Structures are given as C-alpha cells and as structure tokens.
Paper text:
Given the auxotrophic nature of pneumococci for certain amino acids, the Ami ABC transporter system, orchestrating oligopeptide uptake, becomes indispensable in host compartments lacking amino acids. The system comprises five exposed Oligopeptide Binding Proteins (OBPs) and four proteins building the ABC transporter channel. Crucially, SBPs determine the specificity of their respective transport systems, thereby governing the range of molecules capable of entering the cell. The five lipoproteins exhibit pairwise sequence identity of ~52–60% and share a very similar overall folding.
AliC was also crystallized in the open conformation, and its structure manifests all the characteristics delineated for AliD. Remarkably, the crystal structure of AliC unveils a distinctive three-dimensional domain-swapped dimer arrangement. In this configuration, the Lobe 1 (comprising Domain I and II) of one monomer becomes intertwined with the Lobe 2 (Domain III) of the adjacent monomer, resulting in an overall architecture that is identical for the two functional monomeric units. The resulting entwined dimer adopts an open conformation, but the width of the ligand-binding cleft is expanded compared to that observed in AliD, measuring 29 Å instead of 16 Å. The observed domain swapping in AliC would be compatible with its insertion into the membrane, given that both N-terminal ends would be oriented toward the same side. Nevertheless, to date, there is no supporting evidence indicating that a domain-swapped dimer represents a functional state of these SBPs, including AliC. The domain swap in AliC results in an extended interface area of 5173.1 Å2 [calculated with PDBe PISA v1.52], occurring at a hinge axis passing through the middle of the loop connecting α7 with β14 (residues 290–294), extending between Lobe 1 and Lobe 2. This loop in AliC contains a glycine residue (G290) that is unique compared to other homologs, which typically have a lysine residue at that position (K287 in AliD). For instance, AliD presents a significant number of aromatic residues decorating the binding-site cavity, promoting the binding oligopeptides with a high hydrophobic residue content. Both AliB and AliC share strongly acidic pockets P3 and P4 but AliC features distinctive basic pockets P1 and P2.
Residue numbers in the entry:
A (entry chain A), B (entry chain A): 31 to 655
The structure:
C-alpha cells in the first residue's frame, strides 16, 4: 500500500510555543505543522490560499484584503472544538506580538501602517495600526509603501492568528513548551512534546484541507549530535524514514558502498558480431522486391564500395545495442573492428592502434575512426550522406534505380532481434532518406530464418541482402579472425554469397583479391612479430574499409552482481585455462562488489595487463635455445 | 574473514570427460579445473608455467621443448595417488586423440609434424609424429612451420596429458560422464557430477600450486533457463556468489533499483556563503606580516579591483567544497552568485539570467560566467593571471611590494574548515605563484577565531584579510540579499572593515557609492516587477564584479537516503510554511528512492516550478481591485 507514518529526528527543543512572541525556528518548525495562517506554499513555492480562501490588493498596492474560509475551528490539545477562526484573531495575534515585545516584529514593524509608532510607545491603542477585521471573515492590512514581496511575509510566525479568549484565559501559561498552552487549527495536532526526547504530530481529522495531509503520524526522536551514525543505522533497521549522511565522518565511504550502485558489466570478450553484405545473391524466395529492376539495382548497389560505406556510416550502433543490453549497457558491447583492439600487441601498441594507422590511407572518411571497443566511432550521418552521394552518381550512370531495397530477415519470435533489426531500418532510413534506401525487415519463423542463413551452407541458397552473424578466435593471432575472408578457404565467403573456389568475377569487384595478397604477405612472417602484426593490421584496415563485414558488437558486456574479487581469476581468450569457469586464482569476498570498485579495478587491470603482456613479450627472447 | 565456497550455475551437462576426444566447452569447463597441461594463464592472459616448469624453442622455431615439474601425481576420483605425471603422458594423450577420431584435432593436425599423415591413415605407427618424451620429464614437439601462436594451442583440451595404464585398464568406460572415468592432476577434484543437477569441485590438497587455489569448494546447480530470475533471486538470498542479469526481461528495471545507487544530494538552498575581503583593516593582533611595508602593500592591494578579481578567478571552488561534502558532492553546493539564480523571475527568465546579461558590461573577463548553482564558473587560472598582471602594474607604480600576504584565520579544532582553508591557500598560490601572493592560514582556537570575526561587531576589531561567512533571506525579493552592502545600513559592511556611517574614503575607493545608487534606483520600483528585478540584477552584477563578496557555496546539497516521495512536500525559502519540517503534502513510499529516480524527479520539478511560478506571476493581475 503506502506508509502513513514518518519517523526521523529533531535537534533543538522548542523553548516556547508562543509563535507571536518568537520566530526562532526551534518554535516555527513545530508551529508550521499545527497552526495555519492566511496563505501557504504549494510544492512549487507559490503562495496559495490557506485560511484566506481569496485575497486582493488595491490599485495603489497599499491595502491587502483577505477573505477567510468560514468553517475553520480552533481545537484544543485534546481535540475538542473551541471556537470558529475569525478575522479578529489576526488583530489579536499582531497585537500580542507588539504588547509582548516579540523578536519577530522587524519584518513588518515598518511596513504595517502605524505599527512602528505603537511598538515604540508613542501610541497606546491598537486601533491606529493597519490590521482590521472588517467583519468576522475579512482581514485588511494597510501598508506604508507598496511591497511586491508583502505576501511572502504573511507566512511568518509573527503573522499567525491568535484567539483572544484563550490568550487571556490561559494568561502567563500561554505559549509554554507544552501542547495545552496554544490552540490548533492546522494540519496536525501536537500529540507529544517531551524535552530532549520526542515530538509527535497526529493528523487533525477535522482540518479543512485534510485530503492534502497524506502522512497520518509524525515522530521525531531527539538527536544530540553525539552519534552521527545513529541516523543511517536507524534508517537501515527501518526505524527512520530518512537519514542524513555526513561526508566528513570516518564511515562515509562504507555507507557509500552499502547504498551505492552494484551492477557491473563484464568486460567485452573475443567473439565479434557483424553484418554480412550479400554481394552475390541468387536466391530470392524471401524478398520484398517486386521488379527485376529492383533486384538488379540492389545487386549493383551492394557491389559499390561507397554504397556499403554509406550503409556503414549510417548505422546507429548505440540504438541497436540498446535493445539487447541496457540503455546503460548499450555502449558496453559495441565493437568497431573484427580483431579486438588489444587481441595482440607490439611494443606497447595494440593491434587496433596499428590497424587505425593503416586505415586513413583509404580516405578522409576514416578520420577519427578508432578500431576500439566501447564506443561507436563509425556512425556518422554526415559521412554517410557524403558517401551515398558519391555512390548515387556512380550507380545512376549505370541505370540503377532508387530507392535501393534491402532484405533483412529476422526471427519473428525473437523480440530483441526484431527490435534490433527495426532499429537498424530506422537509423539507416533516417540518415540516408527513404527515397534513397529502404531496409525491408522480413519477420519469419525460427526455421525459415535459419534455413536461409545459418543452415544454408550452399552460398547460392543465402537468401538476404544483410544478415547478422559472429566469429570467435581459436588461436592467439590476428589470422584466426582475418582468414575468414580468404579468397580460397575463408569460411565467411558463403555469407557474402561467394563460393570458395569460384566467382573471380565477384572477388575482383569487391577487392578480395587485393585482400588475399595482404593475407599471404602477413602469413609469410613466421618469426618477426613486429612485421607480422603490422601486416595483419593492414588486412584489418582493408576489412574496415571494404565494409563487407559491417561491425556491430562483441560478446561479454553482460550486467551482473557478484561477491567475486574481480580480475584475480585466470584470464584467456583461447584455450581452456582462462575460460569463465576457471576457479584457480579467483578470490571471493563477503561484501557485494560495487560498480565504482569494479570500474576502478578494471582500469587498473587494463593498465597492468598492458604492461605485463609487453614485459612478457620482451621476455620471449630468453626462451630461445 | 573471507569466503571459500563458490556457488553459481551451469547450463550444459558434460556428455563426456574424455578431453582428448572432444573439445566442446561443456566438457572443457569441467576439465580445465581438474586436469593440468603444459602451460596455464595468469590473470593477465600470459601463458605461464603449469606442468612444464620451463620451456624453450629452437632458433628456427620448429622445436618446442618442455621441462616438466617432477613431484606431480595423478590422483583417482577417490583422492588416492595413482602414478607420477611423466612426459610420456603427452604422447599418450595426443595418440589417443588420433586413434579415437577426436573433434579437437584441427588446431594441431597440420602443425605437428607427421600428425596429419597419421590421422589420415597413410602411417600406422605413432613414432613418426612430432611429439616425443626425451625422458620422463621432457616433452618435445616438432612443427612443420614456425608458429608464434603455438603455445596458445597447448592449453586446449586436445593437448592435455593422459596416463596410458589407466586408459587401457578402464577401456571402453574411459571418459564416461562420471568422475571415476578419468584421472586428476589439476587444482580441483571432481566430487559430484549428477546430470541436470549439480557439478561439485573440491580443492586438491596435494596440488603442486595449491597456494594459488583460494576457493576450497565450488558448487554449480543446473540451470535450464526456465526461470531467468532464479539467479538474482538466489543471489539476494545469499545462495549464489554471483548472478547474471538479463536486460530484456520484464523485471530488469526493478532489479536495477534494488541494486542501484540510492544516495541523493538535496537541492541547494537559499543561504549563500562567500568570502569577505577586508578592505579597511586596522587590527593586526593576528597576522603573519612582519613589516609595515607588508601591511601597507596588502591594504593597497585589497583596494585594487583587478587584485580582488585575480583572487576571485584563482579560487578553485570544487577543491574547496570537496573537503566539506563529497568529491561526488563537491559541485552539489557551489554557488557563483549572492542572490540564487531562480530566487525570483520575470517572464520565464531567472534572476541569474538577468544578472548575467548585466555582467559583461564590466569587461571581457566575465565572458562565460553564469551566476548559477551547481558548477564553478568563476575559477579560471588564465583569467586570474591576466587580472593579476593588470593589478601588478597599477600597484607597482604605487610602491607596492610583492608577494602580497593575506591572513586567513580558521578554527584549528575544525578539521573540515582547516582542510578547506588549506585548499584555498593551495589553489590561489598555485594559480598566481607564491612570489606574487601568499595565503597565510592562521590556525587558532574556537574563541579567538570567533573573537576576531563573528563576535567582533566593531569593524575596527575585524582582524583578517579574508574570512568566510554567509547570509540567508528574509523576504521573497532580491533586496533581502543585495541590501547587505548598502553604504549607510548594510549589515555586511563591518565584515569589509567599513562602518555604516563613516569611511566615505573607503566607500568611494571600492565603489560602494555607485552601488548605493543602484540599490535606490531598484528600491524605487514598488510595483513594476520587470523594472524592479532588472534593476536589482544590475546590483548583483556590481557585486559579482566588485569581488568584495567572493562567492563560495550554498546551503543544502547534503547527501541523504529516503523513502519520502521527493518534491511533494510544500516548498518555500522564506516564511515557515515550506520549511524542512513541513509535512502537509508530503508523501511516503515503501521502497528507497534511488538516485536516478530522484534526479529525474528533480529535473521534472525544476521544469514544472519554472512554468508554475510564471503562470502564478501572470495571475497576480486578477487579484487587483
């Protein structure tokens, strides 16, 4: 349901309940809950009607008139009806503040006409002061000067109403620090006021605005400041509704990890996911195209490198991976390469660092593109439109018809895959415009999607224009990734519609023959790791530029909570000795690992892993004999 | 202490424990914990010694030789010593993989010399294959070609050792999915393997590297994927050490708030804290200056506006408020003005918006300075050095001697105040250089700090050059702040060493007479709120430029946790009806408010409060009669 009791603390006892005579907040903090004035504040600070249901100010700004609500009663400490709140109770309160030498008078002493002369003593009768009860329900204030901020003063303790009969009947005991010494017309009764112990309010069931009083009981235990941690301790046990924390105390950091974020996203792993562009499709059993003019224009468009690059630059990876992971986890799985950035290294430089240095040769469009993990560096609508206009003119000189239709199958029963593909259609069509490119998302069963993609071994059966797939490593060398596009044995050629031994026509068109020379020149380096990894980085740059394997994401990046000490476990990306279920070296702890501790441990591990692998590689020389 | 049991899940049963014959990960995930090979991985991925205590490769890269550790034993399922691990066990394992038609052979089939011919069947004797036991503790591999990634292959299941006696003795039952079907030499014993139920490992107490095995017991309950939420549920009950979360499930968001950050910093409040520059000091009972030449040069320096602006631009507020609040709470209390940004508004434009528009008249140094809350916009070391060089030349033409010494008292027993003042000395001296300015932090008792600042009513007793103090509002008008510098009645003049009715000399030097004309012109507007608040914004711009009241911070910004529904409570900055202990309108809830929910509620409240106050101000017209 919803709680109706509020429990917290207070720090200063009220020495007096006479709100007319003192405005120290140790009194007002009680009185503001139990005694109402002319106006209130809403949740936005606006001065809204309280005991005055309406108010007006004269044209000259000197006269303020308040129309009171009629059915409002004063109530005793015991809850018994005393009398009806009348306009004269506002003359009484202000007259009591003057006669009683109140400390809260300087806000209105020189504003209310004739009041300053009455407090100084040069008049002895209150009739001259600019507060009048024109009738039982009309309070009128007259000021010396116009005050645009006057209404902000009517919510002070000095300006509250006081019943004259009760004031004189109780006499010297009026305003004593006990609940029986004042009368109540506000949202709450003061049920208990025990010095250096407790303050208790209970909702007044006859309050005129009882429906806005949503907390029925309020209890404030006395807090001396001797134990700053009693509050967060009581809150954790459920005794307090709220708890102030103190950043300077010796215990703040422990409090921070107990109530801080604990969800962490595992580091990205070695499997790389990408989209395969079918540049040699001869199966159209599942297409949205109608003409052969559309099939032809699509086939020529996909063979154009500028057109594949325009698709690449137009694809919003964050929106695509926000559908599978979180919005907070969307960047945690993005990969802009095929070989992971740090899969190997030479002289402290990661493979992605090497591959990026070879990438700008292919054109200015690769400026600022880093072949890294964690953030989409490829998506660029400006670059995508610039790439497409170049493709548009090349194709338009070949009788190509626009828009280009692109079939992308997806399993209808896979909600995330549908949402992801719909986002792919969205980002590309938004960037390139639907008069240019149309992504035809074809939803279908598990098996027909599978029958035209993953179990369509024969390339001539691959029935799509774009499809998502992945690849993971088998040995600690870039070739385990980069060999999948090998013109004669590459396993990824069937996903592009290319058979391993045929199609020299298509292989030459997409440039896979130039890639083949890059593969063999890199493979020839059997000993020199520097030359070897430099030459494979040239191959990765070709893949990035080719846009045949439009990168999407990696494995890993899954959210989790854990009491495992992170980055103590043995680590590997090939073999079995660093797999996820390897427990040698792993440490456990009693407390949940917080997100901040995990991210600080990850950055330190990243820094140490770089140094360790580099020192290890230098030490490979000592194992020669 | 530290837990020694790991509890989680597994999803695929091992169909076989014969690691030589299959490399499916449903087998390797078990075997990697219980059977060791030549090399391991450390926590960084490096291939480190395992059963081979050292290894070498020939100059041509074709021959790899591994020196085994001697005291390693094979152990039964029961924990009984079987035999000592010898080099021949690596010939046996690879020969078993060939004879048994293993699926994990394609990694090394064409690398190990003569192996491919043996698996194809054109040789029938294993003596031709490039794996040899040169003695009981020397394994030698011969490759067809050099492979810089070869060692990454020796941690695969296919490459693990196998005892020949046990292999032939157990026969057809070898590798069955039961723990008695293999032998153990790795970190763990396989204690239980019940299909679709449990996998249990126990630490092997005789393991050669037992000190790196820090988890004693591992239990993996079978997880079928039928209930994705069983994992986070079991983790919350303490049954699992870790738990994967699934961002697509209907329950992820609830999981996120249960394990997400819950600490929130209350919004900044109306009290403004600032540093008062003593421009008229005639009490030197607590100073670090020695000469009169230093007192004179300091007195003239503080009267220079460029010098006060250089101090202002040089003061790092984030570092100062990182000592009182958190490092995560440091910006949560910063204020760059005297009047709060949104204290009043005209036509949807906040007072800080008005004041900023009047600020750039005073010079280019106020470019990009916003008079807002939340982020230090004043601190600028470039602007501080540019301001000081202008001050340097003006003062150097008046016989002023550098560095300028500035006394700043602080209560020694107040740790935070000491740390804060030391950071003030740090940031200013780092920016301006210690040959130019020196901030002399004078630590002292509670009372002497109090005796020369807050209870030194007479201005001639103010014994400092800079001191921190604050001021809060009494009515909803900018004048409640801006009147404190009034030349004849302003309460803040004594903090600058200026008496309310005297010192026309000093008042004219710092320009407080020009400020006085700004105050009266603004005060003259009794009705037009637009002209009134525009003219007070001109006064605030003068204060910002004067740098007599160098702004520091606000009240509020305190960290807390709460079950209160935020921004339902009545709100006010003057009066008593919106004070912190006002409970009318406040709502409670059962769950702890998370930081994300509180910050989304704050931004929405900020947006609504702006619209509500503006609609309210337009509606003030209907109350005229």
């Amino acid at each position: 349901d919803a709680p109706k009791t509020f429990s917290y603390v207070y720090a200063v006892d009220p020495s007096s309940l006479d709100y007319s005579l003192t405005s120290k907040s140790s009194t007002s903090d009680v009185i503001g809950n139990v005694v109402d004035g002319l106006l209130e504040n809403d949740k936005y600070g606006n001065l809204i009607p309280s005991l005055a249901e309406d108010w007006s100010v004269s044209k000259d700004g000197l006269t303020y008139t308040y129309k009171l609500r009629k059915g409002v009663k004063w109530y005793t400490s015991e809850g018994e009806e005393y009398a009806e709140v009348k306009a004269q109770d506002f003359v009484t309160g202000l007259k009591h503040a003057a006669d009683g030498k109140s400390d809260g008078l300087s806000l209105v002493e020189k504003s209310i006409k004739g009041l300053e002369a009455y407090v100084s003593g040069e008049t002895n009768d209150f009739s001259t002061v600019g507060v009048k009860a024109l009738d039982d329900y009309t309070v009128e204030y007259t000021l010396n000067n116009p005050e645009s901020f006057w209404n902000s003063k009517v919510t002070t303790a000095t300006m509250l109403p006081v019943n004259e009969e009760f004031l004189n009947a109780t006499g010297k005991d009026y305003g004593a620090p006990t609940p029986s010494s004042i009368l109540y017309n506000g949202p709450y009764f003061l049920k208990s006021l025990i010095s250096k112990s407790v303050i208790e309010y209970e909702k007044n069931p006859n309050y005129w605005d009882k429906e806005n009083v949503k907390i029925d009981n309020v209890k404030l235990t006395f807090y001396d400041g001797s134990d700053q941690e009693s509050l967060i301790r009581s809150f954790t046990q459920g005794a307090y509704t709220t708890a102030r924390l103190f950043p300077a105390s010796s215990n703040f950091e422990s409090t921070k990890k107990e109530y801080g974020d604990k969800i962490v996203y595992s580091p990205q792993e070695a499997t790389s996911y990408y989209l395969t562009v079918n540049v040699n499709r001869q199966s159209y059993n599942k297409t949205a195209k109608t003409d052969e003019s559309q099939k032809t224009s699509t086939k020529e468009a996909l063979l154009n490198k500028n057109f594949r690059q325009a698709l690449n630059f137009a694809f919003n990876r964050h929106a695509y991976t926000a559908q599978l992971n979180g919005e907070e986890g969307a960047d945690k799985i993005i990969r802009n390469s095929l070989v992971p950035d740090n899969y190997v290294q030479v002289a402290g430089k990661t493979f992605g660092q090497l591959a990026q240095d070879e990438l700008l040769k292919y054109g200015e469009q690769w400026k600022d593109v880093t072949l890294t993990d964690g953030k989409d560096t490829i998506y660029n609508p400006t670059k995508a439109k610039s790439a497409f206009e170049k493709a548009k003119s090349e194709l338009q000189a070949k009788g190509v018809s626009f828009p280009i239709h692109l079939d992308v199958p997806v399993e209808q029963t896979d909600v995330v895959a549908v949402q992801q593909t719909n986002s792919l259609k969205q980002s590309i069509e938004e960037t390139l415009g639907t008069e240019n490119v149309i992504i035809d998302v074809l939803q279908m069963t598990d098996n027909e999607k599978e029958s035209i993609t993953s179990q369509a071994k024969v390339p001539t059966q691959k029935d799509y224009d774009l499809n998502g797939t992945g690849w993971g490593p088998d040995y600690q060398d870039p070739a385990t990734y980069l060999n999948i596009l090998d013109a004669k044995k590459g396993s990824a050629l069937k996903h592009l519609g290319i058979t391993k031994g045929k199609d020299p026509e298509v292989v030459a068109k997409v440039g896979l023959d130039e890639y083949k020379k890059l593969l063999d020149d890199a493979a020839s380096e059997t000993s020199n790791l520097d030359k070897r990894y430099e030459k494979y980085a040239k191959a990765q740059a070709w893949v990035t530029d080719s846009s045949l394997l439009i990168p999407v994401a990696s494995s890993g990046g899954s959210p989790m909570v854990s009491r495992t000490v992170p980055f103590t476990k043995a680590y590997s990306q090939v073999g079995i000795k660093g797999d996820p279920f390897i427990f040698k070296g792993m440490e456990l702890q009693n407390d949940i690992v917080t997100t901040k501790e995990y991210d600080a441990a990850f950055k330190k591990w990243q820094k140490e892993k770089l140094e360790s692998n580099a020192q290890y590689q230098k030490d490979l020389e000592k194992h020669i004999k």
